RNA sequence: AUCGCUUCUCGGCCGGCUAAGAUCAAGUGUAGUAUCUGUUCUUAUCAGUUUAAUAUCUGAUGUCCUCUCGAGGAC
């Protein structure tokens, strides 16, 4: 016997979504990832309804999904995080009304791993060099340049790896046109695995580090490292530089904190609660994810519990040092 | 202990000899006894290397599938003088074979083992698939009877076998077609 | 017991069908049955031992009804 | 109404019959494979179809010499006949006719949100042209993330059996010198091959 | 003696002599050359350039891979340039 | 009738045929054969003879890839922890063999194994059931 | 290059060699043998 | 084979072998983003909260060694 | 060619000297009493023609008349 | 009819001469395996190493006293 298969109605679920100017035009057309689809999605400026301008399906596991643009550039590209070993650079040309492949990267082995990249993706803000990672042992980088005729090229990859090291999360962080930094939350359980006790379950405090890429070494050196009191579970880029100050939110259980280094102290706030709430007290809260908002004029950034409470969160800084935090109720 | 340890399996069975000495008998006893999952092959402890010649010596050298034996190139292979050999190359014939292209696109399309509950070992060969209730052909025909064998007529009599006492044989508990008359 | 001796049989018999033979009673553990090697033929009588002896004292009761080559096959202990 | 089938967690499929007067409970067969079992569905008496939490499909068949009455760890076993990763984990197995006047065939979900169905073929000549569909499309046409179809689809288990319509079907999508070329490889037109991809799908469904 | 020096698999193009044109690194063989051979400049550079993978003479062409060191995709570890356990040169 | 050893060579050259045969007829529906000679390739294992134990290793990947997985893990599982050091050493080369590549689908073949004190074995995510 | 320390296989080859074709024909018989010649095979005999 | 993680050995320990399949099934479940929504859907939580109670128990499963 | 003359002639040489050896279903030589494997009939039979090969058929020969 | 001899008959085992006529083919090296032959453990006991278990390897021959390995006495 044999069978034909056929799709009639397309998954509905949204597992991602990254906004960029993917056809170079002031409007933003919208990214999004069905569960083993490539989705992309136009909204309208005035009526607001999202037209669907392509889909696709890529026969294998997408991963995560990321979006960037080259330093000052008119357009953005698309970073693919697969199941496969292979990072691939996605280009949607806008007449021909598909994707092309514009980079396709072979790092290692095929599915989802425990050792293998492709699970958590980063990019730099000024878009030089793009990072990926997987859970456990494996954090690879990609530095991008233009070519001679601003055509985007690939470098050779690099090595972060560290033994027996866990990543929860991998987020960019904003340094202008310097030797990139990345916030890669890591923890270590050969503490835990040579403590017959179990004490090492306990009193181990996932580390915060900072990995610089640097260019002129070419190679990418553990840097910063500071012990997290208590577990997050993702990170939040600061705009630095110009804009703002320079630092990461972290995102931790009942609380959040901007943890930067110079000589920047930690600012803690709790995560506020309901007046009047019918749930368990012993189930605390953390935030699901953020969207930041960007702007030539202010910035801020919008965060979510379990609940669905939508979080206005703010910096009040004096001069490049962030004295405290202020975060008002926004909706839900 | 190898025997307590008999107590902690759904099928203590699976324990034997040296698995008493294993470094975690407590989790291969819950191993070997998995549902689907097949045995080891037996040639260790027997230091023989896994085969001698005694019972390969007997065996034919090879046999055709029979789509390969109706369609004829069995016949056409089949000698030479020396000389003869450097005028079959100052001479040389063409075509001995002719076979025909029609057949050799017709036999392994128009015309043309074991499950996985079976692993080979070393001396087995055909005895487990002539047993109490199954027998040849020929020793049928020495026998002479047409299509019980007759001496299961006594196995009514004198009682079950002690050798094999899980016996049925048809008709008398066991309730047979073809050759096999006793599982 | 464990030992039976079997006259009266053809030589187109071997210790194959011998083998097979007994073994639809109970099974032939040491199987003997001559090959002359002079004439290359056989006489037609064997010995058989078994497992232990009730295999083959039950085989002297059923024993004595296998017939080989329409012909009478003798089994007694040994 | 004559059998009962058994869905193991984790053992899959035991094949049950009960018999009447002795009233017991009967298993003369299982799977030869452990799966991770959602819920099943009939094809026919003899066929059995199944889902895994992982999202794959099996189909599993009996043989035809079944023992229907009876009395490592089984007796008989039954051949897996199907084997073929969605991606998309099923929560429901439904075989029905789509629309009216339609050919039969095989309905599942998934839990992604997604709604497909398994048609099966009514000749070989379909069945080989959509092999070489297939073929010069996997290598001339990659899937975008560079990950391979086949492997993607023999993900648990090796494909058995399937051809893959969404493949096939991006065909349109190819350029016109992709398109036509392979056509040639092909040996048919665009417009061709084109309209007898829509015949299975407009046969069988919308 | 020879062994694989295993280093990141880069962009780089593999480059093979005359002698070691047609094989297929692994696999020994000469068969369905598919893919394409990425190494380190790590391994390849300098004098390397376009040097053979392997004797150490000037690369006349690129090697590929078979279609069976794919299928079961060996040609995604560390980049196949055998060093001899002495130096590389 | 080759893989069945009149002397080593054939088990060599006769496995050698069985990985060229199981990389090239992959995914096409043909396992069930290619599982029977499974069964005959199994029993060569076991040897120190460079060649042949290389080309069975060959024979096993590609056997690995065509049959798939889960059938070559329970044809691997008991002889992991067997008391003797030999068959724990060629078991788990083979394990690793498998394991290496395809460690994203053996996940649902681990068999279900109990939990004892210190320690909790069975995953009960599995058992989650609407 | 040709000489060499004398086998048992070669000596016994040579045994049945000399029964079957006679004691004056040395060419035929190293002609059966590896790595020696008529001469060798002669002297050795005798 | 050995920087690869989850080799095995001749002396490979239960507990070493265990925890090692609890953890690549635990980057399977961070991998398949669909078996992950079939937990978030069982237990009632989050995608995330279901992520991070995984990567708590990433290190400890089954808990102390022996 | 010339090697395949001799491999013939040293076979039939060691037909004609020549009742245990043989030719088992590959194509080697061997002593049926002794259990050897020759790599040729004239090796194998010089093994044959051996003091050894000698006794063990004495002993099968004496095993056998008890 | 028997013995002996003989004759016949039947059955079974059952390559010419010459100057011998003249003349006479072997690659290498790196790794590695297999198959032949020859030769060695009647060692007793215990302890340890070691093995799946063997095997193997590693160490010594109830204690004290007296007399000339043996004898006696005390345990
Ligand atoms: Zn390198
Ligand atoms: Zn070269
Ligand atoms: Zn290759
Ligand atoms: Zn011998």
């Known amino acids: ?83 496969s070993g292979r990072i691939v650079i996605l280009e949607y040309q806008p007449s021909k009304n598909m994707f092309e492949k514009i980079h396709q990267e072979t790092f290692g082995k095929s599915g989802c791993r425990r050792i293998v990249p492709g699970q958590f993706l980063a990019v730099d803000p000024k878009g030089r060099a793009v990072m990926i990672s997987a859970i456990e042992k494996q954090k690879l980088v990609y530095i991008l340049n233009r070519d001679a005729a601003a055509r985007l090229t690939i470098s050779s990859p690099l090595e972060a790896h560290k033994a027996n090291t866990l990543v929860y999360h991998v987020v960019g962080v904003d340094v202008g046109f310097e030797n990139p930094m990345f916030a890669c939350l890591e923890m270590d359980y050969e503490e835990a695995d040579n403590d017959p006790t179990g004490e090492a379950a306990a009193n181990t405090q996932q580390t915060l580090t900072f990995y610089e890429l640097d260019l002129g070494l070419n190679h990418v050196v553990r840097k910063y490292s500071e012990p997290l009191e208590e577990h997050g579970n993702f990170l939040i880029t600061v705009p630095g530089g110009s804009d703002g100050p320079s630092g990461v939110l972290i995102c931790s259980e009942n609380y959040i904190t901007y ?33 930041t908002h960007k702007t030539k004029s202010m910035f801020f950034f919008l965060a979510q519990t379990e609940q669905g409470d939508i979080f206005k969160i703010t910096l009040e800084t004096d001069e490049d040092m962030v004295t405290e935090i202020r975060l008002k109720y926004f909706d839900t | 202990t190898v025997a307590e340890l008999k107590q902690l399996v759904a099928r203590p069975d699976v324990v034997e000899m040296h698995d008493v000495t294993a470094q975690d008998p407590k989790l291969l006893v819950h191993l070997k006894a998995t549902r689907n999952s097949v045995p080891v092959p037996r040639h260790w402890c027997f230091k023989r290397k896994y085969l001698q010649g005694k019972r390969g010596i007997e065996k034919p050298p090879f046999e055709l599938p029979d789509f390969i034996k109706r369609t004829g190139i069995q016949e056409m292979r089949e000698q030479k003088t020396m ?101 | 017991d464990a030992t039976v001796y079997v006259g009266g049989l053809d030589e187109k018999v071997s210790e194959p069908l011998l083998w097979e033979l007994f073994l639809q009673a109970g099974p032939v553990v040491n199987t003997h049955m001559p090959k002359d090697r002079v004439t290359g033929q056989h006489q037609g009588y064997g010995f058989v031992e078994f497992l232990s002896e009730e295999d083959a004292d039950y085989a002297i009761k059923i024993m004595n009804m296998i017939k080989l080559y329409g012909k009478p096959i003798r089994v007694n202990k040994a | ?132 569909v297939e073929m010069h499309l996997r290598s001339e046409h990659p899937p975008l993330c560079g990950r391979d179809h086949l492997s993607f689809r023999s993900y648990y288990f090796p494909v058995k059996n399937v051809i893959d319509g969404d493949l096939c079907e991006q065909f349109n999508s190819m350029e016109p010198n992709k398109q036509k070329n392979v056509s040639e490889e092909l040996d048919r037109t665009p417009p061709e091959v084109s309209k007898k991809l829509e015949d299975i799908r407009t046969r069988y469904a919308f | 003696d020879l062994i694989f020096c295993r280093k990141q698999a880069g962009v780089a193009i593999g480059r093979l002599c005359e002698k070691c044109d047609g094989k297929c690194v692994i696999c ?31 690369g006349v062409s690129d090697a590929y891979y078979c279609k069976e060191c794919t299928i079961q995709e060996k040609d995604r570890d560390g980049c196949p340039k055998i060093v001899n356990l002495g130096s590389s040169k | 009738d080759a ?94 063999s498998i394991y290496i590549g395809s460690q994203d689908a053996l996940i649902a073949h681990y068999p279900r194994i109990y939990n004892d004190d210190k320690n909790t074995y069975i995953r009960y995510e599995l058992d989650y059931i609407l | 290059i040709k000489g060499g320390v004398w086998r048992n296989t070669e000596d016994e080859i040579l045994k049945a060699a000399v029964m079957k074709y006679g004691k004056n024909q040395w060419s035929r018989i190293a002609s059966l043998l590896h790595r020696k010649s008529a001469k060798q095979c002669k002297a050795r005999w005798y | 084979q050995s920087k690869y993680i989850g080799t095995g050995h001749a002396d490979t320990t239960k507990w070493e072998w265990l925890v090692n399949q609890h953890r690549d099934s635990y980057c399977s479940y961070m991998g398949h983003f669909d078996l992950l929504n079939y937990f978030a859907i069982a237990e009632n939580e989050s995608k995330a909260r279901v992520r991070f109670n995984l990567m708590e128990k990433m290190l400890q499963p089954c808990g102390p060694p022996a | ?63 056998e008349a008890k």
Request: glycine share 8%; proline share 6%.
């Open chain 2, 83 to 183: 000389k003869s050999k450097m005028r079959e190359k100052v001479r040389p014939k063409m075509g001995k074979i002719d076979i025909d292209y029609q057949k050799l696109h017709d036999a392994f399309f128009k015309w043309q083992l074991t499950i996985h509950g079976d692993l080979y070992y070393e001396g087995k060969e055909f005895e487990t698939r002539k047993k109490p209730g199954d027998l040849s052909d020929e020793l049928r025909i020495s026998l002479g009877m047409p299509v019980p064998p007759p001496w299961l007529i006594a196995m009514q009599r004198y009682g079950p076998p002690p050798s094999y006492p899980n016996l049925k044989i048809p008709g008398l508990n066991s309730p047979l077609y073809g050759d096999v008359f006793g599982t």
């Open chain 1, 1 to 83: 016997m044999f069978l034909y298969n056929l799709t009639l109605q397309r998954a509905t679920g949204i597992s991602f979504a990254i906004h960029g100017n993917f056809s170079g035009t002031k409007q933003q057309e919208i990214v999004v990832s069905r569960g083993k689809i490539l989705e992309l999605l136009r909204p309208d400026p005035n009526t607001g309804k999202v037209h669907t301008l392509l889909t696709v399906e890529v026969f294998g596991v997408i991963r995560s999904l990321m979006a960037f643009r080259l330093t000052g550039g008119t357009k953005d590209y698309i970073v693919v995080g697969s199941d």
């Open chain 4, 1 to 132: 109404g004559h059998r009962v089938i058994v869905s193991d967690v984790q053992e899959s499929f035991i094949w049950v019959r009960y018999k009447r007067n002795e009233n017991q409970l009967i298993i003369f067969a299982d799977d030869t494979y452990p799966r991770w079992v959602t819920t099943a569905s009939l094809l026919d008496y003899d066929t059995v179809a199944g889902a895994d939490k992982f999202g794959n499909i099996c189909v599993v068949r009996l043989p035809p010499n079944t023992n229907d009455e009876v009395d490592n760890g089984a007796s008989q076993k039954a051949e897996v006949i199907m084997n073929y990763h969605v991606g998309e984990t099923v929560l429901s197995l439904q075989k029905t006719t789509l629309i009216p006047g339609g050919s039969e065939s095989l309905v599942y979900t998934t839990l992604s949100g997604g709604i497909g169905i398994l048609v099966p073929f009514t000749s070989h000549e379909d069945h080989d042209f959509f092999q070489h």
């Open chain 1, 259 to 291: 943890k930067n280094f110079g000589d920047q102290p930690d600012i803690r706030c709790p995560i506020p609660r309901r007046r009047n709430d019918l749930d368990d007290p012993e189930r605390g809260m953390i935030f699901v994810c953020s969207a």
């Open chain 5, 28 to 58: 020994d063989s000469y068969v369905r050359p598919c893919t394409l051979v990425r190494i380190c400049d790590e391994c390849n550079y300098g004098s390397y350039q376009g040097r053979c993978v392997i004797c150490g003479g000037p």
């Open chain 9, 1 to 63: 060619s010339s090697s395949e003359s001799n491999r013939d002639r040293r076979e039939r040489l060691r037909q004609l000297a020549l009742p245990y050896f043989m030719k088992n279903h590959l194509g080697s030589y061997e002593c049926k009493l002794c259990l050897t494997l020759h790599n040729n009939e004239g090796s194998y039979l010089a093994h044959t023609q051996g003091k050894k090969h000698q006794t063990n058929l004495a002993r099968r020969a004496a095993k």
């Open chain 6, 3 to 96: 893989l069945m050893d009149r002397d080593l060579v054939h088990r060599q050259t006769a496995s050698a045929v069985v990985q060229h045969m199981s990389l090239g007829v992959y995914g096409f529906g043909c396992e069930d054969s290619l599982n029977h000679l499974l069964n005959y390739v199994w029993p060569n294992v076991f040897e120190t003879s460079p060649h042949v134990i290389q080309a069975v290793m060959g024979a096993l990947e590609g056997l690995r890839v065509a049959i798939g997985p889960c059938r070559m893990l329970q044809y691997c599982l008991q002889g992991l922890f067997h008391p003797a050091r030999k068959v724990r050493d060629v078991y788990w080369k083979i394990y690793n």
